[PDB]
Design a protein around this motif. Structure first.
Motif, mmCIF file in Angstrom:
data_model
loop_
_atom_site.group_PDB
_atom_site.id
_atom_site.type_symbol
_atom_site.label_atom_id
_atom_site.label_comp_id
_atom_site.label_asym_id
_atom_site.label_seq_id
_atom_site.Cartn_x
_atom_site.Cartn_y
_atom_site.Cartn_z
ATOM 1 N N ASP A 73 -0.717 11.329 -18.326
ATOM 2 C CA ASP A 73 0.379 10.813 -17.510
ATOM 3 C C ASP A 73 1.459 10.153 -18.375
ATOM 4 O O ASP A 73 2.661 10.308 -18.119
ATOM 5 C CB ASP A 73 -0.161 9.845 -16.462
ATOM 6 N N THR A 74 1.027 9.436 -19.408
ATOM 7 C CA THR A 74 1.953 8.873 -20.381
ATOM 8 C C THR A 74 2.715 9.978 -21.115
ATOM 9 O O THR A 74 3.929 9.883 -21.306
ATOM 10 C CB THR A 74 1.213 7.999 -21.391
ATOM 11 N N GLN A 75 2.022 11.038 -21.513
ATOM 12 C CA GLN A 75 2.708 12.134 -22.198
ATOM 13 C C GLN A 75 3.766 12.766 -21.301
ATOM 14 O O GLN A 75 4.900 13.009 -21.726
ATOM 15 C CB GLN A 75 1.718 13.210 -22.643
ATOM 16 N N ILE A 99 7.755 12.315 -22.360
ATOM 17 C CA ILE A 99 8.505 13.503 -22.737
ATOM 18 C C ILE A 99 9.571 13.847 -21.692
ATOM 19 O O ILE A 99 10.682 14.260 -22.045
ATOM 20 C CB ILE A 99 7.557 14.691 -23.018
ATOM 21 N N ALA A 100 9.255 13.652 -20.412
ATOM 22 C CA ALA A 100 10.268 13.850 -19.374
ATOM 23 C C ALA A 100 11.496 12.980 -19.654
ATOM 24 O O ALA A 100 12.633 13.447 -19.565
ATOM 25 C CB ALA A 100 9.705 13.552 -17.996
ATOM 26 N N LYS A 123 3.001 21.788 -20.939
ATOM 27 C CA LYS A 123 3.353 21.468 -19.551
ATOM 28 C C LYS A 123 2.168 21.647 -18.605
ATOM 29 O O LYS A 123 1.906 20.792 -17.755
ATOM 30 C CB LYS A 123 4.544 22.299 -19.061
ATOM 31 N N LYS A 124 1.453 22.761 -18.742
ATOM 32 C CA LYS A 124 0.279 22.987 -17.904
ATOM 33 C C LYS A 124 -0.766 21.903 -18.139
ATOM 34 O O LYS A 124 -1.347 21.357 -17.193
ATOM 35 C CB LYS A 124 -0.322 24.363 -18.179
ATOM 36 N N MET A 153 -4.283 21.045 -15.193
ATOM 37 C CA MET A 153 -4.076 19.781 -15.885
ATOM 38 C C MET A 153 -5.369 19.338 -16.570
ATOM 39 O O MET A 153 -6.439 19.348 -15.957
ATOM 40 C CB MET A 153 -3.563 18.711 -14.920
ATOM 41 N N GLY A 154 -5.260 18.990 -17.851
ATOM 42 C CA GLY A 154 -6.388 18.507 -18.626
ATOM 43 C C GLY A 154 -7.386 19.581 -19.041
ATOM 44 O O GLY A 154 -8.373 19.284 -19.716
#
Length: 222
Positions: free
Chosen positions: A5-7, A11-12, A37-38, A50-51
């Motif tokens: 979530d931090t990444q 980056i956003a 992104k995925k 995700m993950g």
């Protein structure tokens, strides 16, 4: 590494960093970035991958953007978003910290320049502009050089004079072959090449003043 979530958040934010003259930005292959992104759930309707190990992007790998060789020049005709994305220094550094840069590779760094014809806005200059340079009377002998959109006519003319060994004491006048057709004077030295309307493949013709004070006629052919 920072959590997913931090990444995604970091980056956003950094993707939207204001473009400022002289800042350095970095290219990231869109193929690597798509996996990232995925993996972090960026622009994801259902977070399905995700993950997941299957989309872990691994070390940053820009090899697909590069031509062969030790110097590692950028492939031509790459398109923003489609082939690469751009991040500022902090964004690049975060990705490297989280994933590593593939060993043996160098970052692909480009500079922000002011672009536009007189009216300016900042842009990362990924590709320089190639101009064709020649001397009046020997227009057959063309030398190409790459310039920044922010380089001035004075800068270009000085490089032309260097290439063709024109001495300091000789006066010159520089011309554009506009529409590959009419000679038009490049008589404003503080215009940038884009202010002056000069784009890839533009033919520029320099002439030297005669000893008797007159200027040579310009070279014409069928």
């Amino acid at each position: 590494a920072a959590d997913l979530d931090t990444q995604r958040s970091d980056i956003a934010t950094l993707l939207k960093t204001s473009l400022r003259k002289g800042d350095t930005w970095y290219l990231v292959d869109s193929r690597w970035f798509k996996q990232w992104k995925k993996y972090v759930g960026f622009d994801s309707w259902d977070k399905y991958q995700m993950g997941d190990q299957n989309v872990y992007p691994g070390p940053i790998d820009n090899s697909g953007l590069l031509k062969d060789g030790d110097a590692q020049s950028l492939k031509e005709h790459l398109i923003d978003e489609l082939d690469y994305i751009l991040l500022p220094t902090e964004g690049w550094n975060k990705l490297v910290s989280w994933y590593t840069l593939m060993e043996g590779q160098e970052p692909i760094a480009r500079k922000v320049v002011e672009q536009g014809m007189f009216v300016k806005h900042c842009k990362v200059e990924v590709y320089l502009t190639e101009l064709k340079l020649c001397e009046n009377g020997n227009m057959n002998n063309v030398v190409t050089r790459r310039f920044s959109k922010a380089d001035t006519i004075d800068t270009i003319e000085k490089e032309i004079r260097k290439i063709f060994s024109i001495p300091d004491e000789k006066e010159t006048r520089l011309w554009n072959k506009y529409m590959s057709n009419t000679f038009e004077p490049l008589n404003k030295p503080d215009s940038t090449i884009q202010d002056a309307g000069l784009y890839q493949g533009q033919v520029l013709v320099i002439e030297q003043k005669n000893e008797d004070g007159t200027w040579p006629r310009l070279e014409h052919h069928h």
